[PDB]
Amino acid sequence: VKKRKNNGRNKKGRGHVKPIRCSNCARCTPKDKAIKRFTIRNMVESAAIRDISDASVFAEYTVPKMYLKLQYCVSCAIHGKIVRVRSREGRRNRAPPPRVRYNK
Amino acid sequence: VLAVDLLNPSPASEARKHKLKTLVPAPRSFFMDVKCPGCFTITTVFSHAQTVVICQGCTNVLCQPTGGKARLTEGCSFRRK
Amino acid sequence: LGPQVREGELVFGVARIFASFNDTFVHVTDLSGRETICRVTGGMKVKADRDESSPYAAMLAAQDVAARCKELGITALHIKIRATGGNGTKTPGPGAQSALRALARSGMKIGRIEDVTPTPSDSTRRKGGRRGRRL
Amino acid sequence: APVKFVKVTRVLGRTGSRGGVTQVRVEFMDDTTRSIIRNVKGPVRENDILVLLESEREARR
Amino acid sequence: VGKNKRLSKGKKGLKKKVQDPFTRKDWYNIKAPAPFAVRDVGKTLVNRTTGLKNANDALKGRIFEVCLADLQKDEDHAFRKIKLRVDEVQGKNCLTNFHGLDFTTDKLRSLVRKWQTLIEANVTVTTTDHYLLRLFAIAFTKRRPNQIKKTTYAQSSQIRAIRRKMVEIIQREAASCTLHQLVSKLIPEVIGREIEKATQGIYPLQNVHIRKVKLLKQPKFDLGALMALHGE
RNA sequence: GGUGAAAUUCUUGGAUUUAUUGAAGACUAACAACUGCGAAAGCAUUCGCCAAGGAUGUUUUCAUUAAUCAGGAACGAAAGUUAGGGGAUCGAAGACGAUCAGAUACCGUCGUAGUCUUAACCAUAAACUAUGCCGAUUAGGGAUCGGACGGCGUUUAUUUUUGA
Ligand SMILES: [Zn+2]
Numbered sequence A: 001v002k003k004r005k006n007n008g009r010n011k012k013g014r015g016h017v018k019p020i021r022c023s024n025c026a027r028c029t030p031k032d033k034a035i036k037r038f039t040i041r042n043m044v045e046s047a048a049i050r051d052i053s054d055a056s057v058f059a060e061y062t063v064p065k066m067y068l069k070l071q072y073c074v075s076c077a078i079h080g081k082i083v084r085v086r087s088r089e090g091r092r093n094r095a096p097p098p099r100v101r102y103n104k
Numbered sequence B: 001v002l003a004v005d006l007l008n009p010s011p012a013s014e015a016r017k018h019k020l021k022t023l024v025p026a027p028r029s030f031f032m033d034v035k036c037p038g039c040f041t042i043t044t045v046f047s048h049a050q051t052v053v054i055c056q057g058c059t060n061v062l063c064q065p066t067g068g069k070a071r072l073t074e075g076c077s078f079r080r081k
Numbered sequence C: 001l002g003p004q005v006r007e008g009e010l011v012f013g014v015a016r017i018f019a020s021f022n023d024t025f026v027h028v029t030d031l032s033g034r035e036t037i038c039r040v041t042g043g044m045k046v047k048a049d050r051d052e053s054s055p056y057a058a059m060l061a062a063q064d065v066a067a068r069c070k071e072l073g074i075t076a077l078h079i080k081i082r083a084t085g086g087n088g089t090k091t092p093g094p095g096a097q098s099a100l101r102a103l104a105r106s107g108m109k110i111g112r113i114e115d116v117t118p119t120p121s122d123s124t125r126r127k128g129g130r131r132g133r134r135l
Numbered sequence D: 001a002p003v004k005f006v007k008v009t010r011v012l013g014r015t016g017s018r019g020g021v022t023q024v025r026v027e028f029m030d031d032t033t034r035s036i037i038r039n040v041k042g043p044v045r046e047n048d049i050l051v052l053l054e055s056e057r058e059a060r061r
Numbered sequence E: 001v002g003k004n005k006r007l008s009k010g011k012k013g014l015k016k017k018v019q020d021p022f023t024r025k026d027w028y029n030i031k032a033p034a035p036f037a038v039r040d041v042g043k044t045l046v047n048r049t050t051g052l053k054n055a056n057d058a059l060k061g062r063i064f065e066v067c068l069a070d071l072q073k074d075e076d077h078a079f080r081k082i083k084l085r086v087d088e089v090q091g092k093n094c095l096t097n098f099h100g101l102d103f104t105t106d107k108l109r110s111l112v113r114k115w116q117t118l119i120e121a122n123v124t125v126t127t128t129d130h131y132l133l134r135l136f137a138i139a140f141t142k143r144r145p146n147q148i149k150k151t152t153y154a155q156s157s158q159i160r161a162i163r164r165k166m167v168e169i170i171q172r173e174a175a176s177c178t179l180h181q182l183v184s185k186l187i188p189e190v191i192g193r194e195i196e197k198a199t200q201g202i203y204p205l206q207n208v209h210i211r212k213v214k215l216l217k218q219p220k221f222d223l224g225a226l227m228a229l230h231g232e
Numbered sequence F: 001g002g003u004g005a006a007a008u009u010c011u012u013g014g015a016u017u018u019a020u021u022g023a024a025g026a027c028u029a030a031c032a033a034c035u036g037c038g039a040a041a042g043c044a045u046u047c048g049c050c051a052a053g054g055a056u057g058u059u060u061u062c063a064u065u066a067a068u069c070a071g072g073a074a075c076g077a078a079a080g081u082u083a084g085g086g087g088a089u090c091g092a093a094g095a096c097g098a099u100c101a102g103a104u105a106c107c108g109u110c111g112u113a114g115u116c117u118u119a120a121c122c123a124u125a126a127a128c129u130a131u132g133c134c135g136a137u138u139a140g141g142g143a144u145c146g147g148a149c150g151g152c153g154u155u156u157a158u159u160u161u162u163g164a
């Protein structure tokens, strides 16, 4: 039986695609099959910003950000709880989850 | 739908179909007479000419070929004959 | 002993923090990179060698840098954090942020934070094989 | 040692593998601007008073 | 860890006698070329002059990283850093001139985004002064205010037209200039704004910049030229 | 250094770390997508030269010149084979350190053929859409790539026609 209509790959209209290296176990997987996450964060955590802020010599200062793109094989994706198993009917839903914008 | 008169389509509905998919095929091209400002002659030019057309007198260009219908020189006028 | 200067002015240094996932390095040089002023690693402070990367060890190693560099006359630092780089994780280790605070709290001045991790445009083959570490 | 005194203003859940440990947010009660996160072992109420030996460790989450 | 050393000093060795090597160091000041606003940029350290080891030989091949914000006293130029190479040493003073340019790492990563087109080109050029130096360029596609379509992509034929236009502009601007003249054009970003006007017809192409400049060859030292810009 | 924790290994004959410079070979990050091309295998840095191809447009030209094919022929990833060049990185075989009742393995430090290229062989893959090729008809919808046609505006240039 086919578990997924797209074979869980997202590759139709071509024959080959170069692989990539997993960011955790350094495995080789096709680029279209890997799970990709883009992350934007600050250099320092929010509790430490005040100590840096008042120790500067430039009056008001803005700590820079850091930009990373991590990408995993499926075996490392669901062991680190990046994604998890869904139900049979809930599998066919590709909308990104609604991030909480009120936080109680 | 389920009851249609296929013999008498509206003229508006036939202006949108492909040139070959109508009830009877018919071209949508035409010939035209171009008035060169420099001279007083008249030349018959196809609407979809693939070659640069030169007028008989004073030897001036009148149109430039392209992918579809040739574009005329800016300082020129034409009538559909 | 130290640079002669008026009381208003302050002299600058640069700190190069190398924080991997196995150890952390605190290194202070002059304005250029040629001359090293002080350098202490996280392994000098801890005695169990599984805590060389612990955030606690970075704080202790960072504190005596400020003490040791205080009498040299340098009063301000530039900061350049870097990860392993190359084929590595490119994510700074746990001790990267612990050391930075200890310089600020100790009384030293801070300016111009930056990240200088080296990234390849197209790298050679990476260690592990095609199947990865299967544990 | 320059020991500091802190006071608890709100409690934020109970951590630990077996629920022994509790996590609280304290206030330094001398510089009202500053506020950090700490970990405590015993039962804690609001307006409780704690003594802190070092004030640079903080805690996860 | 204290109790891991096994070989220690090695096959056979003995402890040292004299320590604290910082008692013999000296401090020097660093100056800046003519176009920049502020001249003092910091201090440097070196061993004291002695027999068999002159101090000036060690202060002739050093370079320094100074942010453009400090030199111009302006926080707008907070993402560009340039290098200064020491040439001559007066009494307790080091003289420097231009040695390159480069963006900061964080500014460049913020520019690149998905569903856009990245265009980049490079070309070598030489000035009237026989300096061989290379320039890099970068640009991105620009969205339209009333656009509804999700992605803004240019056709690869259009990309080559823009790439050809970049090379032509760079050569023309640097054709008749000196190294001092060229630097005076980098800090007001004349090249970027001139490129944008020319490529307007092909495609909008927001965010034109000169990514970095590095030099490859140098002529004779010509000490007379260095003193012209310094000591004003 | 490396690991869940350790050891083998390198070190005041200055290890690890810091800045400048040089040589060699391999590879083209981010942009990169339910997007493009090719008979399939496959193909991603710039520029110059050489021949080839699909779609669209057309009041050009020939007039059945067509479909599928037993035998037959061209191309055909990776590994492997024969002679030269090259040999940075990874790493079959091999040698050690741990774990374990045992461990010829999973983990760690080294490391030969190979990995790259020129001239010739080999003809097999879950070579997969597990779905042969030509032709006709059958239901609604919104996205997207290439060409043409129509239109109200904005933007913009030695600016119009074009491009967005
Ligand atoms: Zn993995």
Ligand SMILES: [Zn+2]
Binding pocket: B036, B038, B039, B040, B041, B055, B057, B058, B059
């Ligand atoms: Zn005429």
